[PDB]
Design a binder for these strands. Structure first.
Ligand SMILES: Nc1ccn([C@H]2C[C@H](O)[C@@H](COP(=O)(O)NP(=O)(O)OP(=O)(O)O)O2)c(=O)n1
Ligand SMILES: [Mg+2]
Ligand SMILES: [Mg+2]
Length: 428
DNA sequence: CGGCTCACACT
DNA sequence: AGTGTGAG
């Protein structure tokens, strides 16, 4: 079991929110640009950054005023604001454009607003059959990188030169006659991804990057290797060298506490080092599921299927009221619950029309001042009507007990966060 | 005051 | 049903 059974691709839009703004606002194109929200506080928080802007060191989770210091000419596009909160509708709609195009080629799993996993196994089989021993031209893979290539013995000075040489080595090595071979399958998968990315760009004007491999983790990792506007094929064989110097945190789901735990407990830095441990050893340290996943993953093997899901399982609205802005009155809490409910209602109504389904559960989450937990309390009630007033009213009923204060016209402790989430969808 | 938004494991 | 982790 070499985990070479599937052909999986992860496609991620390059600086997605920026591209959406750049398409709509042509003046932003091919310039250091960022997308920000909530301009009032420090010029707004940057949530997307063009590659021209990244050259100046501008990053996500950076204040616009600070970004300006690094990049004086940085152009900014503001996230739409509705009812006192950021509205992401344009980006969701832009996302739908991309997802629908991708869906034409194969079943997709919407991993995020700007990326999706594709299981191309079946599509590859069909493509392999359509061409009988047809040699795969380099022209079919104009933006493809083969990780780990070129290897061995002035063209390579340029990145395009390196890409070509690597591709040539790979293609020269490829034997068409073996329809079964995983490398061949990955290659054909890459050809389809080229087509998928060309279609996306032609039809949306959005550029994207892609990773092609035998699983989701490798595909996602591969995608990031040659961003932007490029796709990378990571073969099973490329894994040992790739993982040998690959920081553990870089593997998906290893970015947080578990990753640090793996590093600290095992005293290792790289993904490859995990191979020297028995599955039982890994299981003992990190649990049954994690241990087995780690044992297989460090060998480039993962079995997490590409879920056939294009739609979010939940629709959520929330707002932060940090520090001084915390809501300390009942009226204040009710008004904000209403604003969140109103946006939620609009999105829910659209969802029902577009997707033939209804949310049956309303989830309410709040944060009181002095908690470092993202959520202080979680509570749920039935969502029976797509009405903002009822939903906000119900949400308030569910969380009204949290209010310590006797006066009751005041709210204590003050709420630093309000969250409304529609869940438990059903067909209709 | 890196904000808003999802998915999912564990209990 | 609720809490926490991880991600984008
Ligand atoms: N913390 C984050 C991460 C992403 N996003 C949004 C903005 C991003 O443009 C979009 C996609 O996330 P992302 O793929 O990780 N980064 P982005 O697409 O902007 O650039 P790339 O590095 O992928 O090329 O989700 C966000 O709002 N908050
Ligand atoms: Mg992206
Ligand atoms: Mg992404």
């Amino acid at each position: 079991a070499t985990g070479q059974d599937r052909v999986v691709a992860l496609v991620d839009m390059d600086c997605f929110f920026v591209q959406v703004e750049q398409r709509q606002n042509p003046h932003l194109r091919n310039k250091p640009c960022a997308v920000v929200q909530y301009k009032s506080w420090k010029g707004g928080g940057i949530i997307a950054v063009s590659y021209e802007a990244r050259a100046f060191g501008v990053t996500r989770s950076m204040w616009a005023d600070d970004a300006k210091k690094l990049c004086p000419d940085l152009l900014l596009a503001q996230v739409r604001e509705s009812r006192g909160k950021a509205n992401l509708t344009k980006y969701r709609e832009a996302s739908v454009e991309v997802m629908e195009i991708m869906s034409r080629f194969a079943v997709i799993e919407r991993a995020s607003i700007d990326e999706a996993y594709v299981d191309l196994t079946s599509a590859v089989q069909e493509r392999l059959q359509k061409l009988q021993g047809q040699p795969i031209s380099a022209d079919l893979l104009p933006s493809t990188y083969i990780e780990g290539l070129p290897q061995g013995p002035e063209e390579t000075v340029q990145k395009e030169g390196m890409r070509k040489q690597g591709l040539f080595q790979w293609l020269d090595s490829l034997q068409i006659d073996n329809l079964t071979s995983p490398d061949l399958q990955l290659t054909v998968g890459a050809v389809i991804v080229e087509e998928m990315r060309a279609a996306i760009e032609r039809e949306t004007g959005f550029q994207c990057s892609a990773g092609i491999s035998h699983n989701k983790v490798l595909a996602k990792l591969a995608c990031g290797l040659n961003k932007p506007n490029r796709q990378t094929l990571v073969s099973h064989g490329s894994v040992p060298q790739l993982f040998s110097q690959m920081p553990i945190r870089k593997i998906r789901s290893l970015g947080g506490k578990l990753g640090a735990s793996v590093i600290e407990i095992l005293g290792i830095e790289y993904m490859g080092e995990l191979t020297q441990f028995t599955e039982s050893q890994l299981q003992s340290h990190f649990g049954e599921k994690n241990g087995s996943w780690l044992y297989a993953m460090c060998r480039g093997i993962e079995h997490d299927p590409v879920k056939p899901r294009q739609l979010p399982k939940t629709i959520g609205c929330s707002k932060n009221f940090p520090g001084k802005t915390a809501l300390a009155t009942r009226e204040q809490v009710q008004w904000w619950l209403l604003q969140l409910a109103q946006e939620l209602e609009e999105r829910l109504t659209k969802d029902r029309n577009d997707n033939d389904r209804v949310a049956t559960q309303l989830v309410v989450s709040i944060r009181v001042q002095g908690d470092k937990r993202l959520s202080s309390l979680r509570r749920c009630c039935a969502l029976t009507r797509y009405d903002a007033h009822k939903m906000s009213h119900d949400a308030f009923t569910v969380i009204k007990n949290c209010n310590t204060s006797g006066i009751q016209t005041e709210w204590s402790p003050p709420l630093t966060m309000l969250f409304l989430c529609a869940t438990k969808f059903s067909a209709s």
